[PDB]
Amino acid sequence: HMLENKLGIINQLELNRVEERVSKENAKRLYDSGDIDRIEVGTFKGLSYIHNYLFEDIYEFAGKVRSQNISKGNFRFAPVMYLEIALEHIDKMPQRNLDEIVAKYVEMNIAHPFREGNGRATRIWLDLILKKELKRVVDWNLINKEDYLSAMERSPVKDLEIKYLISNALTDKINDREIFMKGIDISYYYEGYTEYNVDEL
Amino acid sequence: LENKLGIINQLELNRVEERVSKENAKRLYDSGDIDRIEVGTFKGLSYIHNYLFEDIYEFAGKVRSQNISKGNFRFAPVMYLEIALEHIDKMPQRNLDEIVAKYVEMNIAHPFREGNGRATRIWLDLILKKELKRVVDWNLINKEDYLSAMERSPVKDLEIKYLISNALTDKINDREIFMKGIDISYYYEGYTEYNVDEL
Ligand SMILES: Nc1ncnc2c1ncn2[C@@H]1O[C@H](COP(=O)(O)O)[C@@H](O)[C@H]1O
Ligand SMILES: Nc1ncnc2c1ncn2[C@@H]1O[C@H](COP(=O)(O)O)[C@@H](O)[C@H]1O
Ligand SMILES: [Ca+2]
Ligand SMILES: [Ca+2]
Ligand SMILES: [Ca+2]
Ligand SMILES: [Ca+2]
Ligand SMILES: [Ca+2]
Ligand SMILES: [Ca+2]
Ligand SMILES: [Cl-]
Ligand SMILES: [Cl-]
């Protein structure tokens, strides 16, 4: 049993691998065409664009505010009954420093506005806030998978674990294709996608 | 995590760990060694774990010496592991309710540093096969439904029991069912590069 998709795939392994190829392919194009730099920074509109850009081919819900309730582990993400107003309040949150950018990122993860693909899209969106505001981007290879997922699970209660991780992984190489491309490979790895290397179209 | 091959990169250790242990999982089955071992004991679980990770981890098939936590859940304390595993061995396994309860306790014990999910799911299928003449068609269980049901299982095993019951197959000697199951088991832990049968 799995997520409804456009391509009518009924095998979990099959969907995981094809989603990874169509979406990482899109992620490569997003960076290379410079479409990435024309996107609105720190807003839901910007996140929505990143999400639709990646999952347009495989998912009907790509870039849309979900109409269903979702959860991971023992945590329920922002209920549909107030998800939209909660998103309007995230758009207004300041992003003037790391403590603020991390707090805003933690709230956007709680909102979790999409049916699936929240993690990957919100990590691209965060890197552009850090790029704009601190002239820093994350080197996702410096953060261990287990450490990241554990910090995010804790983040609705105390964001110090994820703050320390982002802080110690920040790099000044803001226009480096390798830092981005590797970060995409590490981002997908966090979500359990390990078949492709983004380098290849 | 420290490995035998001295791998420092996380992505590198992930695909090497997958290659090596999945090739071992294929050989475990194809040699028929899988059916030569003890069903429902820590001895059998320990054999399965050693068989999978003996090339990569020094701790393969060995009981952990450090305490572990997943979220706000603490697994069996290292000091009580020996006692807990002896009690699990004594747990009945006559029907699905008993088999699932045994599996749930074994997951709470989590006797190894790493690879509990993968080694215990193989162990579970062998208890199901011996006692019910059923095995799990793991594709019929969503990754996140499975993971959420496992995290819930110490409080209520209704969720995981429901997933296991609705995925039971009588294809006990089906190699394709076993192989697809290993690939899904590894995918549950985030390893999606290889197909076990292509090794
Ligand atoms: N239990 C949790 N509580 C809060 N955030 C979580 C939890 N588990 C995972 N996450 C976040 O959710 C992302 C996955 O996005 P998705 O697959 O759409 O749910 C991860 O990359 C984390 O940022
Ligand atoms: N919070 C949790 N509570 C109980 N069992 C869990 C939890 N998270 C994961 N698991 C189980 O742990 C396995 C992963 O094993 P390992 O990576 O060795 O710790 C999964 O396949 C689940 O069966
Ligand atoms: Ca996901
Ligand atoms: Ca490959
Ligand atoms: Ca070997
Ligand atoms: Ca060897
Ligand atoms: Ca693991
Ligand atoms: Ca492959
Ligand atoms: Cl995701
Ligand atoms: Cl595992």
Residue numbers in the entry:
A (entry chain B): 7 to 207
B (entry chain A): 9 to 207
From the paper:
To gain further insight into the enzymatic properties of EfFIC, we solved the crystal structure of EfFICWT bound to AMP, used as a surrogate of the product of the AMPylation reaction. Electron-rich density was observed next to AMP in the active site, ascribed to a calcium ion present in the crystallization solution to the exclusion of all other metal ions. Ca2+ binds to six oxygen atoms, including a phosphate oxygen of AMP, the carboxylate oxygen of the acidic residue in the FIC motif (Glu115), and three water molecules, one of which is also bound to the inhibitory glutamate (Glu190), with the seventh ligand missing. The position of Ca2+ in the EfFICWT-AMP structure is shifted with respect to that of Mg2+ observed in other FIC protein structures in complex with ATP, raising the intriguing possibility that it may support an alternative biochemical activity. The nucleophilic water molecule is readily identified as the missing ligand needed to complete the heptahedral coordination sphere of Ca2+ in the EfFIC-AMP-Ca2+ structure, where it would be precisely positioned for in-line nucleophilic attack. Based on the observations that the α- and β-phosphates of ATP bind with canonical positions to wild-type EfFIC and that AMPylation is potentiated by mutation of the conserved glutamate in various FIC proteins, we propose that the primary role of this glutamate in AMPylation is to mitigate the efficiency of this reaction in the presence of Mg2+, rather than to fully repress it, possibly in order to match AMPylation and deAMPylation efficiencies. In the deAMPylation mechanism depicted in Fig. 5 (see also discussion in Supplementary Discussion and Supplementary Fig. 3), the conserved glutamate activates a water molecule for nucleophilic attack of the phosphorus of the AMP moiety of the AMPylated substrate, and the invariant histidine generates the free hydroxyl group in the protein residue by giving up a proton, as also proposed in ref.
The most frequent PTM reaction catalyzed by FIC enzymes is the addition of AMP using ATP as a cofactor, coined AMPylation or adenylylation. Enterococcus faecalis FIC belongs to class III FIC proteins, which are comprised of a single FIC domain and carry an autoinhibitory glutamate in their C-terminal α-helix. We discover that EfFIC has both AMPylation and deAMPylation activities borne by the same active site. Furthermore, the conserved glutamate implements a Ca2+-controlled metal switch that tunes the balance between these activities without conformational change.
